[PDB]
Structures are given as structure tokens and as C-alpha cells.
């Protein structure tokens, strides 16, 4: 089988990683949700270029 995708194999290190106390993981999760929303908006922008 082909090697695991680099964009996710290396994402494993930076995603789902313990950083700080109870005030950190939820902040980084909401930032990740914001950037995911930005990616979704970018994807639909090129629908009609």
C-alpha cells in the first residue's frame, strides 16, 4: 500500500496534540474550525472563477 499522505501524515503531529491546560485545546480547536471554514469558502470561490 502507498505511504500515508504527507498532508495528513505530518498533520498527525500538529493536529490532535496536547499543548496546554483546559483553556488551550478548545481555543486551538475553534481556530482549526475557523481555518476549515476559510478553506470551505475558498473551495466554493473557484466554482465560477
Amino acid at each position: 500500500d502507498l505511504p500515508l499522505t504527507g498532508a495528513q501524515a505530518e498533520l498527525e503531529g500538529e493536529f490532535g496534540k496536547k499543548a496546554d491546560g483546559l483553556l488551550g485545546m478548545f481555543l486551538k480547536r475553534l481556530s482549526s474550525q475557523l481555518i476549515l471554514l476559510q478553506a470551505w469558502t475558498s473551495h466554493l470561490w473557484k466554482m465560477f472563477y
Binding site: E12, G16, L22, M25
Partner: protein
Amino acid sequence: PSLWKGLVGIGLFALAHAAFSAAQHRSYMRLTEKEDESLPIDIVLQTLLAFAVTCYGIVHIAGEFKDMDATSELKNKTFDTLRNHPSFYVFNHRGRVLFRP
């Protein structure tokens, strides 16, 4: 008043956000193939708090109880309103004369 509707809406929104977060975390975890079964504590706290707040808010809008005693609402009823029969009204009196004869 109307703040309970806002409270229950906020609780439902928080529960939905927690659901989306848990689904996203599970989807990410299944990619890395880690059998540690790591459930973050903050998500559990958030969903429990949202559930408790939503239940407390929704218990206050179901309505209000009423006394089962049949003689409870008649303590203020008076005979002035009991002798009026709408089906037997007659308009032959001095009210017509007094107002614009």
C-alpha cells in the same frame, strides 16, 4: 419572561457545536490509526454543561400548574356577571335614550 427561549437556544447551539467537534475529532483520529481512545475532557465538560443548562431552561417553559380544587377560581366571581345571559339580551331600555336619542 422571554430569556428562557434564548437560554434554551444557546444550550442547543452549544450541544450541536460539541457534537460537531466530537465528530471531527473522531474523523481525525481514525486517520492516524491510534487505538488509545483519547476523548478530550473539555468536550465532555462542554456537552454536560450544555445539557444541564438546556434541561434547566426547558423545565421553566412547559407551563404552570393549576389548583385542582373546583371552588378555587369562583372566590372572585360575583353575581353581577352571573345574571347576564347573552342569548336573552334585549335592547329596549334607557341606554338608547341616554346616548343619542
